[PDB]
Each structure stands twice: as structure tokens, then as C-alpha cells.
Scaffold this active site. Structure first.
Site, short mmCIF file in Angstrom:
data_model
loop_
_atom_site.label_atom_id
_atom_site.label_comp_id
_atom_site.label_asym_id
_atom_site.label_seq_id
_atom_site.Cartn_x
_atom_site.Cartn_y
_atom_site.Cartn_z
CG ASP A 87 -0.35 0.08 2.54
OD1 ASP A 87 0.50 -0.73 2.85
OD2 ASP A 87 -0.82 0.84 3.39
CD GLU A 106 3.72 1.29 7.25
OE1 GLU A 106 3.37 1.94 6.18
OE2 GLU A 106 4.25 1.81 8.26
C1 LIG Z 1 8.59 3.96 7.97
C2 LIG Z 1 7.85 5.24 7.59
C3 LIG Z 1 7.35 5.17 6.16
S1 LIG Z 1 5.92 4.08 5.98
C4 LIG Z 1 8.77 6.42 7.75
O1 LIG Z 1 9.97 6.30 7.53
N1 LIG Z 1 8.21 7.56 8.12
C5 LIG Z 1 6.81 7.77 8.45
C6 LIG Z 1 6.76 9.14 9.11
C7 LIG Z 1 8.13 9.77 8.98
C8 LIG Z 1 9.02 8.78 8.24
C9 LIG Z 1 10.27 8.53 9.02
O2 LIG Z 1 10.29 7.62 9.99
O3 LIG Z 1 11.28 9.17 8.79
ZN LIG Z 2 4.83 5.39 4.44
ZN LIG Z 3 6.60 2.52 4.40
#
Ligand SMILES: C[C@H](CS)C(=O)N1CCC[C@H]1C(=O)O
Ligand SMILES: [Zn+2]
Ligand SMILES: [Zn+2]
Ligand SMILES: C[C@H](CS)C(=O)N1CCC[C@H]1C(=O)O
Ligand SMILES: [Zn+2]
Ligand SMILES: [Zn+2]
Lengths: 375, 375
Positions: B69, B134
Site C-alpha cells: 500500500d 501498513e
Molecule cells: C517507515 C515510515 C514510512 S511508511 C517512515 O519512515 N516515516 C513515516 C513518518 C516519517 C518517516 C520517518 O520515519 O522518517
Molecule cells: Zn509510508
Molecule cells: Zn513505508
């Protein structure tokens, strides 16, 4: 004794003069007092009706001031008797406007009647300054009538605003002034971002927090013999997007001062800015002032009302400046001395608003006592 | 070298698998890896699709995990090329999911292909644990698949979650754990009233202020070699009726901790309650925990990924726990060691999301390097 005050108060309360509609209350007053030599001057502005009724051409000028509008009733079925069908119950008169402030108006009109009958050749002048918008934004009511009077040098020596001022028993409290009201609308600026990277965002709740604390702990002033200490109070605070994983980019806060003559509008603004700046807060701040404090110190008018209350009600009236404000804040510009005096304000703007029946002829006899001691 | 990873990433990005729809991405993966001996097990729950694909029956079990997704695109015309028509531009591949996280998936599938060709008789097992939710509430995705695996004692030795982890250049950062997330929803109770009678009301902004300050100044912990200090951040604050002359009767505040293993969920709750109680605040507080911190300390898996990155990319990878969280928080219950490793996360969840083209075959060669060092 007399029941003329009661009967007129009923007739007034029966008209649904929700702001800024008058439902001909001002016409009824004008035509009734025309019979004892009050000239009527209609001063309409926008959707608001105002009248200046006056008997006599010379000083001293004693004015009663008040409003024929009332606040909304809310759902009628929640009332014990319909709000615009005045009812006597348990020694009280119930209806919207029974306390705020149609009963005062009726009492003053009857006092004028009894006074003029007893003293047809009295000196000075008697005037009524009546608006159909005190309760709303009030841009077109008393404040416009005052400007007209002031522009033609038609000044007042003594003014009694018929707002309900008593705590419980009639005459226990009169107001000789009111606090000013100064409001701010603050927008604290940060930078929005994901909550898990706080070093890349600026949280405006956090930058504001140390200033918020200092503001709510601040002692603004001492008050004095006439005024309580100046009061700061936050009314609204809103920030965030609704998401629980986002730091918001701004925070809105609305606050108000009810301030005494010990502090000034400019001084308070300065202190707020200095608090916010000391803590490094970044913000926009818009101010609005709906009124300056006003005060009539102890003098002929306060002495007279006290003596009248002592004679009629048997109690020693307290002078007060507490609570909200009134149209005295406009009228004080043209009145050398001004007080507010009326029945209990306990039930104002609430369901089942009422006034004690025994207080109605007493109020009128107080007003008549004042007229007699001034004219 | 190879362009198979790129070609598969394009094919994946072209399917608009906005959560929780899969648009047959999981079918495409299953059928492709079926050709080299991955058995497919579909695990649907509610509206979410999940698959467990597995080649081999013995330990060590190496699993790639990820999500098909993607987050919504927002208004398409604001994009420079359409979000589901992958485009090569200026040395980048642009499209929704190019970074988060379809390119990782494609790279792993091709690494499996090259590894199995070179080492048809390798020991151990290779599995993929893929969800179509997710990005949403994730109640029916990975967490349900893990519970199934755990209930039948089907455990993982080494897991690589293909989330984008790089700061800028591929391999500069891998994640060996994440902070927990603990959120509170606080309602501070006061008593509404007219603002000019503050002694008859209780202002919940004012009662909260000293606690707010203490909370935003609090040092929760020191962090450690693996984790930054635990972080407290207010996301939302709302109180008031919208009237500027009323003290509100309550104040809502939403806040979150991203916490390290130095603090515990129960300890943090206790500290918050104790701060609020020290200042006499009256409140309701509802808590929710979306995840505990998780950590794989330095060991075979971190060493292997580092060595693979050094060989392919020529740089020394940093271990990190910073940022948000991932489905590793569920999979760690059944994986003895787990890391996250993918391309740059700079453009995730934003318009014009992209991945550097040169990073695509490099990523696959990193994953292939890991497989070779573990199996
Ligand atoms: C694992 C998720 C992506 S699904 C991610 O890296 N994010 C989601 C919010 C911010 C950013 C981060 O951790 O740097
Ligand atoms: Zn993401
Ligand atoms: Zn992700
Ligand atoms: C003069 C007004 C009525 S129009 C008043 O007394 N108010 C309005 C708000 C509260 C209450 C008070 O001052 O006690
Ligand atoms: Zn009123
Ligand atoms: Zn009033």
C-alpha cells in the site's frame, strides 16, 4: 403601596424586544411621559432605536439611562412560565427582562410621575436615555446618542443607569464605575512537522508555555478603595490539525483583561508584549478595547443614593465596580457623576429570570428619593 | 548493471494501491517467485491483503518484510508527472511509492532471483511478509500475520524491513530499532462562567499552565548508544466556547511520547500523572500505546548489512533508531534480529516522491549481499 410600577413592568416584559428590536417599548414610554412634559427625540441609527426624553431646559440635569432590548430566551419549554408572559409566583415576577432591565425602567417612569405631581415647579431637568441595543454589538445605540449630545453641548450632571446591581436584596450594592475590558487575539507561530522529528519543527504550544505560565501568575496591580485588582483570563486556546502525530505550525489564544484605573490600556499591552518577548515567542497579536474603566468617586450622587436606599430599604449600600460593564462607559463622557442602581442581578440572562415583587415599589421609591434630593 | 529491479519497480508503482487496496501487487510477486520455489500463503483479514511467501523449510530463516500500500497522492495536477505513471527524470524515478516502498520490494525480489540462480542449493529459508495495510490503522495487516506465525512456531532468525531509511545516499543509514509511541488524551476540568467573575469559575487553561510548563521542560531520559533521549510533544490543544467573555469549563490536550528503552510505558504514565497531580490539576486522561520500542543490538545482522553496504556502496553505514515507526514493531516478536534498510526517505508521503536511479540496482545488490552472508 403603588402598583403602577408593577403594571408597567408587566406591560414592558410582555413585548419580545430581543436585540435590536424595540417592539414599541420606546413609543409607549415617550407617549406616557409626554403627558407630564417630557419632549421626545427619536435617534435611530442602523437597525437600533434610541430615544432622548427630556423635561426641562436647565441644570442640574438628572438622567435615567437603560435599554429596552433583552437577550434571547432559549428553548421556551425549559422555562417554568412563558418568558414573555410575566407571571407572579412565590413572591417573584418572572419573565425575560424582569431583572435586566425593564422593571428599572418602569420604576423610574413612575417615580418621575410621582415626583412631578408633588413638585410641579422643581428646578433642573429630568431625562431618559433609552437604547434598543445594549446587549448586542451596541455600535448604534447609546454611544451614538452620547456623541449627538456631546456635539451640541447637552451635558448631564447626574446619571443613574438602571442596570440590576444588587447581590441579593435591593439596595445592598450600587455601582459607581466599571473595569475596562481589553482583549487580545494572539497567534503564536511555529513550524509544522511530523511529531517524531521535533528538531525540524517548532512547537508553538511549547514555545508559548513559559509565557503562558508567567501571564497567568502575573500580578497586574493592587486594586484600590474602589476597584479590585486587574484580572487577566484566557477565554479560548486552539492549535493543532487534529492529527496526533503532527506538531502544529501555529497556536491561537484569546485573552481578556478587566482592568482597574491602577493600570492603563497601553501599560497592559506593553507588559504582555514584554512577557512574550522575554521568552522568545514569535507571534502576531491583535488587540481590541471595548471600554476604558470609569469611576465616579464619593460625592453628591453616591451620598444621595445611599441616603435614599437607607430611607427606603433600611440598609447601607456598598459601592462597587465589580462585574461586567454597561453603557455607563459611554455616558460617563457627558455625565459628571454616574452610578448604576437596580434590583438583583442573580438571574440575568438565564431561564426563569425574575425580580422580587416587594422590591418593585421599593426601587421606584429609591429613584423618587434620588430625584427629590437632587432637584 | 541489471535493469530487472527498475522494471519491476515501475510495474509495481503503476498500480494505485492506496491503503488497503493491493491492486494485485501481491499476486504479481507470488507468481513471479513461485517460479524459483517460493510457496505462497494468502492471509486476508477484513479488507487487508497479506501474503507469506517462503522458499525452504529449515533455519536460518531470512525474511524480507514490507507493504504494497501507498499513501494518497493528493491533487494530481500538483505533481510534475502523474503519480502512478513512473517517470525517469534527472536521474531519478518519480512516482507514489517509488521510495516508500515499492522499489525495495522490487530490489529484493530480483536479489532472490540472482541469489537462488548462483546458489541453488543454499541452506536455510527465504521468506517475504507483505501487507496491503501498513499506512492506515494497520489492525489487519502485519500484526495478524505475525500472530499466525507465532501460534504455529514459525520463527524468523533474520528480518530486513525494506522501509526507506537513508538520509541521502543509499546505505548511509540503517535502522536497528525504533522508539515506542505512547499517546495521551487529557481533559482538564474547570468550571465555565462569565469572564468578569473569575472567582466563581475555574479556568482550565490556568490550572493546566504550570503542569504544561513542567511537561515541556522535563528531561525524560539520557538516551543511550542506540537511542536518542525520549521525546514529549503536544499535538493538539483546544478549549473554549468561541466567546471572548467566557471562561471555559474544560480543556483538551493531546500529546505523544516517542520513547527509548531507557524509559518504560508505565514509568512515563506515572510521571505525567505525578506532574499533573503535584499542581492540583483535575482531569481525565486516556492513554493509548501504538508500539513498544524495539532494538536489535550489534550482532551478526547489523555486521552483515554494514559489510554489504561497504562492498556495494563504499560507505560506512550508521545504525539508527530515529524517526517514526514501522511494522518491525510487530515482527520483532518473532524475529531474533531485525533491521530496516532502504533508499532515501526524504520524499516519502510527499508530492514528486522519487528514488535515485543509480540507487536501484545498488539496493538489490545490497540485499543479495545480505542473503549471501547469511545463507
Ligand atoms: C517507515 C515510515 C514510512 S511508511 C517512515 O519512515 N516515516 C513515516 C513518518 C516519517 C518517516 C520517518 O520515519 O522518517
Ligand atoms: Zn509510508
Ligand atoms: Zn513505508
Ligand atoms: C450590566 C450587565 C447586564 S446587561 C450585567 O450586570 N452583567 C452582564 C454580564 C454579567 C452581569 C454582571 O455584570 O454581573
Ligand atoms: Zn443584560
Ligand atoms: Zn442590562
Amino acid at each position: 403601596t403603588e402598583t403602577q410600577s408593577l403594571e408597567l413592568a408587566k406591560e414592558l416584559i410582555s413585548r419580545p424586544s430581543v436585540t435590536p428590536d424595540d417592539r414599541d417599548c420606546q413609543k409607549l414610554l415617550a407617549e406616557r411621559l409626554h403627558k407630564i412634559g417630557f419632549a421626545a427625540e427619536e435617534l435611530h441609527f442602523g437597525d437600533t432605536k434610541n430615544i432622548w426624553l427630556r423635561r426641562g431646559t436647565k441644570a442640574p440635569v438628572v438622567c435615567f439611562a437603560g435599554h429596552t432590548d433583552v437577550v434571547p430566551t432559549g428553548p421556551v419549554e425549559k422555562w417554568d412560565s412563558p418568558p414573555f408572559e410575566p407571571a407572579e409566583r412565590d413572591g417573584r415576577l418572572y419573565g425575560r427582562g424582569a431583572a435586566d432591565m425593564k422593571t428599572s425602567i418602569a420604576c423610574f417612569v413612575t417615580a418621575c410621575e410621582r415626583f412631578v405631581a408633588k413638585h410641579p415647579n422643581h428646578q433642573g431637568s429630568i431625562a431618559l436615555l433609552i437604547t434598543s441595543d445594549e446587549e448586542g454589538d451596541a455600535l448604534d445605540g447609546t454611544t451614538k446618542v452620547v456623541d449627538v449630545l456631546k456635539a451640541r453641548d447637552e451635558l448631564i450632571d447626574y446619571c443613574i443607569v438602571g442596570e440590576p446591581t444588587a447581590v441579593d436584596k435591593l439596595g445592598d450594592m450600587i455601582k459607581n464605575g466599571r473595569r475596562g475590558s481589553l482583549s487580545g487575539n494572539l497567534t503564536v507561530k511555529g513550524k509544522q512537522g511530523h511529531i517524531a522529528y521535533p528538531h525540524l519543527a517548532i512547537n508553538p504550544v511549547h514555545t508559548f508555555a513559559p509565557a503562558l505560565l508567567e501571564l497567568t501568575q502575573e500580578v497586574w496591580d493592587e486594586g484600590n478603595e474602589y476597584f479590585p485588582p486587574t484580572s487577566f483570563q484566557i477565554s479560548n486556546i486552539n492549535g493543532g490539525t487534529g492529527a496526533t502525530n503532527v506538531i502544529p505550525g501555529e497556536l491561537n489564544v484569546k485573552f481578556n483583561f478587566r482592568f482597574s484605573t491602577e493600570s492603563t490600556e497601553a501599560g497592559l499591552k506593553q507588559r504582555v508584549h514584554a512577557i512574550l518577548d522575554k521568552h522568545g515567542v514569535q507571534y502576531d497579536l491583535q488587540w481590541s478595547c471595548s471600554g476604558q474603566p470609569f469611576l465616579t468617586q464619593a460625592g453628591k450622587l453616591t451620598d444621595v443614593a445611599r441616603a435614599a436606599i437607607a430611607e427606603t430599604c433600611g440598609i447601607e449600600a456598598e459601592l462597587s465596580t465589580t462585574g461586567g460593564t454597561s453603557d455607563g462607559r459611554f455616558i460617563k463622557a457627558i455625565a459628571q457623576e454616574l452610578i448604576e442602581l437596580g434590583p438583583s442581578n442573580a438571574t440575568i440572562h438565564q431561564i426563569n429570570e425574575n425580580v422580587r415583587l416587594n422590591d418593585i415599589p421599593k426601587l421606584s421609591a429609591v429613584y423618587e428619593g434620588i430625584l427629590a434630593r437632587l432637584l
